[PDB]
Amino acid sequence: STGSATTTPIDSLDDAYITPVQIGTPAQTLNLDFDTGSSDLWVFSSETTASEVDGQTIYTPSKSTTAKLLSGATWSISYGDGSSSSGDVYTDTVSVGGLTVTGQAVESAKKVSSSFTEDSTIDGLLGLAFSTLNTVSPTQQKTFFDNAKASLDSPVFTADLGYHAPGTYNFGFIDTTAYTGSITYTAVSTKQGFWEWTSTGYAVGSGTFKSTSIDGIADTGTTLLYLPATVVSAYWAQVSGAKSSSSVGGYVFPCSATLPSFTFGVGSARIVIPGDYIDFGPISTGSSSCFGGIQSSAGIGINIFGDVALKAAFVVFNGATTPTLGFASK
């Protein structure tokens, strides 16, 4: 089997991407944030505290003839940005882009934190990291990809995120028309539960490439590119007037600036992030200070190749017995 679904930016900045997902029978379509940095499929639901729902579409398990309470199971997750959610668990049929999994754990939110309530466009998350990070207790549950893997033509999914445009998540096949040149594959460590890999270096604009190992994760659920402070300082030093602002929470730059590109290495290959992908616009409406899309990881504990990086590439998440990542230009 295979599946193919369009993923669409939630706003004009590409702050996140939503993909329609069919849950239950008859189908209830919810727009979920596919997140290669977590491993829970959780949704706003008929069980979510009413004051914490503000415009999201909800899953109502009692209206699904295939829903079954997973007795005794609870979940609770806290994300790297400080947000969180928790609840109970049903199993139900879940389909993405024509690919159907029966018996998928659908984690129904009883509580969500403010940032989720305040985003009416995201009806939940679909985690695509390794199932060892799934938070369901006392019986850990498998991700959608893990459940689908054996049925797929090839044990892979691909992320082709658009810049200010829709893109595609494919499951079970690699669309050879979706990228240019060749895909370069690189080793993955699953020891932390992430799609963790080592970039071979970077360049700023037309500058020389610096060969250096940068360990990080490929994370579709993180908006920006978080890298070591040395790298980030080298980038923003090429933008006149750019500075790190403690009050804003990162590097800002004059909105009148033209940003240089940023290149990262994948083995001997190179992925170029155009400067325009690094512009996240005014820090507040009407401001002439703009927020940068490359930020320091120094306070995170891990480097994160988020959407800013991933949207410059066609990315293969190879879930073979020994997983690998592939990157191609496009």
From Swiss-Prot:
The keyword Disulfide bond applies. Its EC number is 3.4.23.22. It catalyses: Hydrolysis of proteins with specificity similar to that of pepsin A, prefers hydrophobic residues at P1 and P1', but does not cleave 14-Ala-|-Leu-15 in the B chain of insulin or Z-Glu-Tyr. Clots milk. Disulfide bonds join C255-C290. The active site is at D35, S199. Residues 17-328 form the Peptidase A1 domain. GO terms for biological process: proteolysis. Keywords: Aspartyl protease, Disulfide bond, Hydrolase, Protease, Signal, Zymogen. GO terms for molecular function: aspartic-type endopeptidase activity. Belongs to the peptidase A1 family. This is Endothiapepsin. It comes from Cryphonectria parasitica (Chestnut blight fungus). The chain holds residues 90 to 419 of 419 of the full protein.
